[PDB]
């Protein structure tokens with residue numbers, strides 16, 4: 035079987051993308067953030083502290099005839115940005131784009147951090163990293179993809195994120211009309227639970243390509259591109275007036291500048307990120323300083339190919355027994 039679902043940016047800067055997911059019987063539709071950097075399916079619910087809910091659609095397990103409490107199970111997650119949530123665990127039927135999984139662990143939030151409360155458009159997260167990262171205790175739970183794998187035509191899903199526009203997540207098949215050229219596949223390390231791969235180098239604008247190994251993760255759940263300080267410094271040096279700002283916490287640039295493109299290597303292929311994708315607009319309303327979409331990973335400890343990079347490509351997540359990542363131009 036297969037599934038296909040449209041994913042939509044939550045705001046005009048593409049800060050995150052939401053995809054409708056049907057949970058329970060009869061279906062409750064929630065808009066979830068599909069996150070290849072984590073492995074928990076958690077949702078705002080009827081159990082969430084009322085002061086921590088501000089416009090989100092909630093899952094109500096008591097109204098689902100297929101929901102079962104997973105006795106004694108709990109979960110607690112903290113994200114790399116300092117975000118967190120925690121609560122208890124149901125199992126229920128979950129469908130994405132026509133693809134149905136019965137007995138999926140649905141983690142019900144009792145508590146969420148403030149950054150989730152303030153993001154009224156995101157009802158929860160759907161984790162798509164490897165199940166070794168799932169936080170359910172005492173019994174670890176499988177991801178939606180892991181549960182669906184057996185029944186998929188092909189054990190793959192693909193991410194086709196739009197620039198200021200809707201895109202598509204497909205499960206179980208590769209749409210050969212959605213890209214140009216060939217797909218280049220590259221090896222994945224699962225040893226930390228992430229879709230981790232090694233880029234073969236980079237170029238700034240029309241500069242020479244620099245061959246150099248950049249290890250990092252493919253993460254639909256992270257907005258920006260986080261790369262080593264040496265790389266990020268070479269990019270922003272080409273932008274007149276750009277500088278790293280400690281008060282803002284990253285590189286900013288004059289909003290009147292035009293940004294160079296950024297190229298990253300996948301084996302012998304090249305993915306080009308247009309300079310417009312790297313503009314994240316004014317740091318505050320009315321400011322003439324704009325925030326850059328390429329930032330240093332020095333404080334984070336790992337390099338992250340977030341949405342800025344992934345939306346420039348058609349991306350195959352191949353969950354075969356030897357996993358790989360495919361990139362194509364589009």
Ligand SMILES: NCc1ccc(C(F)(F)F)cc1
Nearest residue numbers: 071072113114253255256336
């Ligand atoms: N999108 C999930 C996520 C969040 C943070 C991290 C970090 F910072 F730990 F790498 C990885 C993955």
Ligand SMILES: NCc1ccc(C(F)(F)F)cc1
Nearest residue numbers: 069113117149150153255256
């Ligand atoms: N990388 C996972 C993640 C996704 C979204 C958020 C936000 F923006 F909703 F707070 C935080 C962390």
